[PDB]
Amino acid sequence: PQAVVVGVMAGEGVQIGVLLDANAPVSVMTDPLLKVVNSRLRELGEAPLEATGRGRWALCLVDGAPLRATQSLTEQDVYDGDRLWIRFIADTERRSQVIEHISTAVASDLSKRFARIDPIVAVQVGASMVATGVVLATGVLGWWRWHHNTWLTTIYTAVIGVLVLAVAMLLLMRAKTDADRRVADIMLMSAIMPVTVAAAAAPPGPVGSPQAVLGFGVLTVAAALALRFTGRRLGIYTTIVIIGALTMLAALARMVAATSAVTLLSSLLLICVVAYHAAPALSRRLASSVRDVLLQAERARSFLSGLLTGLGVMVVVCMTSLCDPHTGQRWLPLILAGFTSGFLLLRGRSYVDRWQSITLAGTAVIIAAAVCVRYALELSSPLAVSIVAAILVLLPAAGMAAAAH
Amino acid sequence: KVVNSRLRELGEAPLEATGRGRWALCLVDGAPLRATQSLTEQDVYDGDRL
């Protein structure tokens, strides 16, 4: 217990293993320690550490935060096998500055601490406004087809899709910087929506099973094709491919033959259940020498975050459609929802990533809450709403309490 | 001897250890000094710490 071995980082990156005195105060070691790292760098043939003007030498954690100069190395939470960094921190002493006349003083200070609008942000805002605009136009065009059978909806939407896509295509070839690419990506992201309803609107007669199949098909193809050719925005495109593909299969079955929705809903739940287990493997297969490691790591992380999210959307939509307050053995889907919630709650903590673990944890809470709301709006009564409210408020309160206590 | 003698006047326990080995001077990183060479041959000057 008299000494601890730790790695010390020095100038430009040399890590050196050292056996330090565990109880002397850290300020006693930084001077001779600087001499030692310099001696080794000199023999290695490298350039030694040097001061610049006014400042001091300190020993810090890898995070840069300095250790308290008067405390012992054992007094701080430093253990054998950890690492530290020796660093130069410059002098902050300078004159103070004063402006008395109030109007000038407000203008001066307020301009140094905040950011003004610029031409770069103006274009990103413009792109965002047009994307929002076209989804509103397709919405009203779709709302017309859902009550009318004329060619108008497909003819009108097709030209919009082609025009937006033509602009995005021309922008992608010319983009030079990430600022330019974000503008183009927003434009491209919006092109998928009109083409989807444009195709689904083509088959005549009343809307339903046969029309739905085309939309989810072209949606799945377009999202996948955009990803393949662009190689950016993995998350948003991947999530669409999952929900699109799974919906296409269900739509095809219902169009051909299906005894009940419960059958399809149960099938989807089962498909997602196995997919949650296979999720990391799917991501691993879907995903000068050092670069090869860095690129692959974030790629897999991207695909996995979207995958886990898309499955969440399917099960919440499916489970809320499976449970009911009046049909048959009312308790059966409720306990099934409970078991489903427990699995997601337990398995969500195994993933070593904040957004993946957080997104999975949140997915369970919304499923539970949706069932409670269903059991309050339908089968309505004063006791029922009172009971649901108590359950609905205490459930998340208890979840927080388990972590806070 | 003088270090142990001084420690007792301060009320501190003298240097003591168990096992096969020996006592010697070391640098802040634990590296022992050379046993057969002068402190003038080594890089030791007034105000250094050991």
């Binding site: 105060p25 300020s27 001077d31 008067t70 | 000057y45 007034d46 105000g47 250094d48 710490r49």
Partner: peptide, 18 residues
């Protein structure tokens, strides 16, 4: 400055001569 800081500076200065 503390006694420790003073001795720390004093030891550093004790290393040099004309």
């Amino acid at each position: 400055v503390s006694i420790a800081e003073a001795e720390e500076f004093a030891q550093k200065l004790a290393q040099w001569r004309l």
